[PDB]
Amino acid sequence: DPSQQFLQQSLERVYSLQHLDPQGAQELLEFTIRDLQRLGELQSELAGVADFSATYLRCQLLLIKALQEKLWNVAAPLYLKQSDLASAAAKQIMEETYKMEFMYSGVENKQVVIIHHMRLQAKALQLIVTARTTRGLDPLFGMCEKFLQEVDFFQRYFIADLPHLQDSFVDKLLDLMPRLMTSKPAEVVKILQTMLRQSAFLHLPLPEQIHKASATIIEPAGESDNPLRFTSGLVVALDVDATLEHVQDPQNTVKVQVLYPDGQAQMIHPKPADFRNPGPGRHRLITQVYLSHTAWTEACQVEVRLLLAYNEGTIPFSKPVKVYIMPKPA
């Protein structure tokens, strides 16, 4: 079929053209990310594969953009925080790597090693960016030895997968392991930067079957309904119905977040009895989430969203909905 052929062709095009200049490389990555997002929008079965690959390519694009910003960066005391987006890039790669690890199904270990390798790259980038700012030596030593411990744990866990990671960041890092162990933090940061820039883009082996974890809140619906009244101080129960697609263990992972119009946020852990399983890879969540707040002058709207949890930390995976509540006193 043409969709799979196009997907494989685009990925091969990205992999082959890794000798380009940074501008050409990042514009090729942007083109391919846009193409994969559109292909995910069109096809249903290849939405998972397209979004998985596009997330990986977005991680790589953020990494190379941050390294070009580092090329734009200069000596440490002259560093400007407002104009830098490398730390934001590292955080974004962090959250996207979590997304590929957990928010997709059918992920074999051969993809988990690549996800963790990109995670290690993001941690190295965050370490380097922090070193660009911090004038303290003790915190720098602390984060440096933490990163080296993370590298060691990666080497321990994925020891059987290292031959598949030729010319990678972690491979070259493991080559010069004891020197990094016994070097000064500033020297470590410098060689880490140089090795990040010279690292090779690892191929992402596609799984045979993979689907994105999706959820659809359907019971509250649009805000055309009248506000829920008489809630001042006491509780109002909002019935939540949702269809969850391709979540193997939703009970321990799916959570319900409620965001009131103030900064307060509520986190809810539904019991397994709420989840129903009418079909394979297609759950049905029915439950009540209890909301309470003081009296309001005007009927504001409260945002209710479904999140996935991983182990800590959480990531949203459902479209937010809003419902109006008028907690009138009496």
Partner: peptide, 26 residues
């Protein structure tokens, strides 16, 4: 401005905490 501030700090106020060398990435 930051250059003058850093020079003052590293020469007078905190030479022991002068941090790493001025390794220009650019």
């Amino acid at each position: 401005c930051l250059l003058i501030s850093h020079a003052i700090e590293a020469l007078i106020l905190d030479p022991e905490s002068a941090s790493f060398q001025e390794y220009g990435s650019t």
